[PDB]
């Protein structure tokens, strides 16, 4: 499968509205994910969604499984200080390959 993150870098100022795109191509119902990676550490689970129309969320972020538009855009109304890191959109093939395909990631730099 494949995952596309149309945004490589995203610059925003405190409390700005955040949206990081995620479009994909899969071979069936996969489970969509979002991982966050802060400076110096490994990627960590943010949240997931198994069924279409379902919404995953955590720490203020959220995405909605839109199987029709094959998207799972991450959103957070007001980005804080600690949000600045790298976000990866991923699709887990828990029901098939059990392989997790990741996007290219998106670095979020939040200025005061």
């Amino acid at each position: 499968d494949s995952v596309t993150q149309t945004g490589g870098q995203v610059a925003l100022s405190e409390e700005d509205f955040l949206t990081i795109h995620c479009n994909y191509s899969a071979s069936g119902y996969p489970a969509l994910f979002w991982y966050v990676q802060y400076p110096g550490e490994g990627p960590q689970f943010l949240f997931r969604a198994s069924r279409d129309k379902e919404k995953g969320s955590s720490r203020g972020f959220e995405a909605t499984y839109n199987k029709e538009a094959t998207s799972f855009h991450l959103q957070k109304a007001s980005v804080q200080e600690s949000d600045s890191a790298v976000y990866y959109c991923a699709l887990s093939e828990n029901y098939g390959n059990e392989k997790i395909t990741f996007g290219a990631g998106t670095k979020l730099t939040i200025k005061p």
Partner: protein, 111 residues
């Protein structure tokens, strides 16, 4: 939960490098990824369970070993400059749609 070693490594072209991964929750699945700008995270090798190994999307130049359930290692037989990236190991939690938990990672630089 999942620990990797070494955290920092510099090799010379041709050096044989082994990256070690240890999980503590006994999941059957373990994965080795490298993270590169413009590519994010790509699977090199992964393991369905103890004693078995499976090629990922970009296995060339690597080999892995899963002697046990808790340990999965990645080896670069003869390091090349292109292998210069950050390697992340992870175990798969089946109860959460295979939600992964990565180790801190190994920053490898090939001189």
């Amino acid at each position: 939960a999942v620990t990797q070693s070494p955290r920092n490594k510099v090799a010379v072209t041709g050096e044989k490098v082994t990256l070690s991964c240890n999980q503590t929750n006994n999941h059957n699945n373990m994965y080795w990824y490298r993270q590169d700008t413009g590519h994010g995270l790509r699977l090199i090798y992964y393991s369905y369970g103890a004693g078995s190994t499976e090629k990922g999307d970009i296995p060339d130049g690597y080999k892995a070993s899963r002697p046990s359930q808790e340990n999965f290692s990645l080896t670069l037989e003869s390091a090349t400059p292109s292998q210069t990236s950050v390697y992340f190991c992870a175990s798969g939690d089946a109860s959460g749609a295979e939600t992964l938990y990565f180790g801190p990672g190994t920053r490898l630089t090939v001189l």
